[PDB]
Design an enzyme around this catalytic site. Structure first.
Site, PDB file in Angstrom:
ATOM      1  N   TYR A 233      -3.866   2.769  -9.707  1.00  0.00           N
ATOM      2  CA  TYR A 233      -3.159   3.815  -8.970  1.00  0.00           C
ATOM      3  C   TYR A 233      -1.747   3.433  -8.523  1.00  0.00           C
ATOM      4  O   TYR A 233      -0.772   3.976  -9.061  1.00  0.00           O
ATOM      5  CB  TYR A 233      -4.011   4.269  -7.777  1.00  0.00           C
ATOM      6  CG  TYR A 233      -3.496   5.560  -7.171  1.00  0.00           C
ATOM      7  CD1 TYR A 233      -3.880   6.800  -7.681  1.00  0.00           C
ATOM      8  CD2 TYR A 233      -2.579   5.522  -6.140  1.00  0.00           C
ATOM      9  CE1 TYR A 233      -3.390   7.983  -7.132  1.00  0.00           C
ATOM     10  CE2 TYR A 233      -2.084   6.693  -5.583  1.00  0.00           C
ATOM     11  CZ  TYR A 233      -2.483   7.903  -6.084  1.00  0.00           C
ATOM     12  OH  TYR A 233      -1.988   9.051  -5.522  1.00  0.00           O
TER      13      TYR A 233
ATOM     14  N   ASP B 191      -3.836  -0.075   6.409  1.00  0.00           N
ATOM     15  CA  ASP B 191      -4.571  -0.692   5.323  1.00  0.00           C
ATOM     16  C   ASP B 191      -3.812  -1.879   4.758  1.00  0.00           C
ATOM     17  O   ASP B 191      -4.433  -2.820   4.274  1.00  0.00           O
ATOM     18  CB  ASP B 191      -4.875   0.343   4.229  1.00  0.00           C
ATOM     19  CG  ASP B 191      -6.002   1.295   4.618  1.00  0.00           C
ATOM     20  OD1 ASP B 191      -6.649   1.084   5.679  1.00  0.00           O
ATOM     21  OD2 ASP B 191      -6.234   2.267   3.864  1.00  0.00           O
TER      22      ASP B 191
ATOM     23  N   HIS C 250      -7.670   3.975   6.122  1.00  0.00           N
ATOM     24  CA  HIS C 250      -7.249   5.073   5.243  1.00  0.00           C
ATOM     25  C   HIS C 250      -5.834   5.565   5.553  1.00  0.00           C
ATOM     26  O   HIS C 250      -5.477   6.702   5.210  1.00  0.00           O
ATOM     27  CB  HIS C 250      -8.242   6.248   5.289  1.00  0.00           C
ATOM     28  CG  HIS C 250      -9.678   5.839   5.135  1.00  0.00           C
ATOM     29  ND1 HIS C 250     -10.195   5.358   3.949  1.00  0.00           N
ATOM     30  CD2 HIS C 250     -10.707   5.848   6.017  1.00  0.00           C
ATOM     31  CE1 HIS C 250     -11.479   5.086   4.108  1.00  0.00           C
ATOM     32  NE2 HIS C 250     -11.814   5.373   5.354  1.00  0.00           N
TER      33      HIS C 250
ATOM     34  N   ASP D  64       0.854  -1.176   0.000  1.00  0.00           N
ATOM     35  CA  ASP D  64       0.000   0.000   0.000  1.00  0.00           C
ATOM     36  C   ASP D  64       0.893   1.229   0.000  1.00  0.00           C
ATOM     37  O   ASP D  64       2.044   1.171   0.432  1.00  0.00           O
ATOM     38  CB  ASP D  64      -0.929   0.030   1.211  1.00  0.00           C
ATOM     39  CG  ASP D  64      -2.161   0.921   0.999  1.00  0.00           C
ATOM     40  OD1 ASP D  64      -2.257   1.666  -0.003  1.00  0.00           O
ATOM     41  OD2 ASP D  64      -3.055   0.860   1.862  1.00  0.00           O
TER      42      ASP D  64
ATOM     43  N   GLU E  48       0.798   5.823   0.158  1.00  0.00           N
ATOM     44  CA  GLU E  48       0.137   7.112   0.240  1.00  0.00           C
ATOM     45  C   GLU E  48       0.856   8.042  -0.716  1.00  0.00           C
ATOM     46  O   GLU E  48       2.027   7.822  -1.041  1.00  0.00           O
ATOM     47  CB  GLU E  48       0.160   7.648   1.655  1.00  0.00           C
ATOM     48  CG  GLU E  48      -0.612   6.746   2.602  1.00  0.00           C
ATOM     49  CD  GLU E  48      -0.499   7.185   4.034  1.00  0.00           C
ATOM     50  OE1 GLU E  48       0.282   8.120   4.305  1.00  0.00           O
ATOM     51  OE2 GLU E  48      -1.191   6.597   4.891  1.00  0.00           O
ATOM     52  N   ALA E  49       0.132   9.046  -1.205  1.00  0.00           N
ATOM     53  CA  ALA E  49       0.670   9.933  -2.220  1.00  0.00           C
ATOM     54  C   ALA E  49       0.008  11.289  -2.061  1.00  0.00           C
ATOM     55  O   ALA E  49      -0.966  11.449  -1.324  1.00  0.00           O
ATOM     56  CB  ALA E  49       0.454   9.364  -3.637  1.00  0.00           C
TER      57      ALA E  49
END
Lengths: 209, 223
Positions: free
Chosen positions: A114, A175, A170, A19, A21-22
């Site tokens: 993504y 996650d 989130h 996973d 985040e961006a």
């Protein structure tokens, strides 16, 4: 039986649940700010209580400073001294992957739309060959749609399967563990779907250039 | 003055291994949690008796690796975890090798320097054993510029200032009146260690700054 039908790339020996985040959505030309990996040998996968994680798991979690602000925050990553997505990070990733039995398959929720294209873009910026170029990948949204034969958000799936609320929703850190739990619901069936649908990460198109 | 300046990263460290020192043990699992000084400093102040268990900082780097040893674990060494030599080999783990040192070095290099390892009983066990494992390799030591401290001494100092077993679990239960989660495993105990060090982070950082020593001065457990 199955005279004309075989696995595309053999049995995957490692699943790497992934996973990230961006800073924002694709048209913003986003940059990765966190990357979390949980590497599991296929043997660890070979209401229902939530499965405990396998005892043998390799984990890597890194916070990453972007070049531009988010829509985590850039300023807070910088006061924590986080470094950019750079060549040293590629050395780290390459060395981490080298410890996993091959073939290795990334598993990410919405990875096809993504995480995988974004990672391809970040890795393309570096001088050194991408450390993912012999790895495979699959999207767990597709996997869980096949296994549940409805929202397919990570948290909605977890509650639908386990009938309790997920932990640390989130966030990439939380996650990726939720993802692992969802993939342990029917672990043999998940592995079979992954073997049947794995594709080379080298075929992933960059999100942007 | 401070021996090595203010530490900018604390790397909480725990490991699993095949046995006690006389068995000439090998590392079977290495768990690191790297926290910037500022992230520790921004922890909500402990208030109340007991204070809540601090939440981990939002920004933490993590590395956790299982390692196949050359020898079998001692009787009962892999009981709680299940990390026997046979199981680590069944799951394809590689030995402690040059690539692992390269991996550790690249992980350390993402952390602001100076960097200090923090391990409970590290001076008597974790650090000497890691020194031994690294001495077998052909790479420089990946810990050559890194410092280290033992959290037993740290918490002894911090509890004496606020005032007795100093096992990790005893300290945590004394501070938070709760049993530690996943007790007596490296994976669980490294997080328990972070939580204890978040109890009084300013005093902990001051103690760490004053007592940090180079990892290169750690004597190998065995040769």
């Amino acid at each position: 039986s199955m005279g004309s039908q075989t696995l595309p790339h053999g049995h995957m020996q490692t699943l790497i649940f992934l996973d990230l985040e961006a800073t924002g959505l694709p048209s913003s030309r986003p940059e990765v700010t966190e990357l979390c990996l949980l590497a599991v040998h296929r043997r660890a996968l070979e209401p229902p209580p939530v499965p405990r994680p396998p005892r043998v798991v390799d984990k890597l979690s890194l916070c990453i400073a972007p070049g531009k602000a988010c829509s985590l925050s850039k300023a807070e990553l910088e006061v924590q001294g986080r470094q950019r997505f750079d060549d040293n990070l590629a050395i780290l990733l390459r060395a981490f992957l080298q410890r996993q039995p091959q073939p290795c398959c990334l598993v990410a929720h919405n990875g096809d739309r993504y995480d995988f294209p974004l990672l391809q873009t970040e890795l393309a910026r570096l001088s050194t060959p991408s450390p993912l170029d012999g790895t495979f990948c699959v999207d767990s949204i597709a996997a869980l749609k096949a296994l549940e034969q409805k929202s397919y958000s990570l948290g909605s799936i977890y509650t639908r399967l386990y009938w309790q609320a997920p932990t640390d929703s989130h966030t990439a850190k939380g996650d990726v563990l939720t993802l692992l739990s969802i993939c342990q619901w029917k672990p043999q069936a998940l592995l079979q779907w992954v073997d049947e649908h794995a594709r080379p990460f080298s075929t992933v198109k960059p999100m942007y250039g």
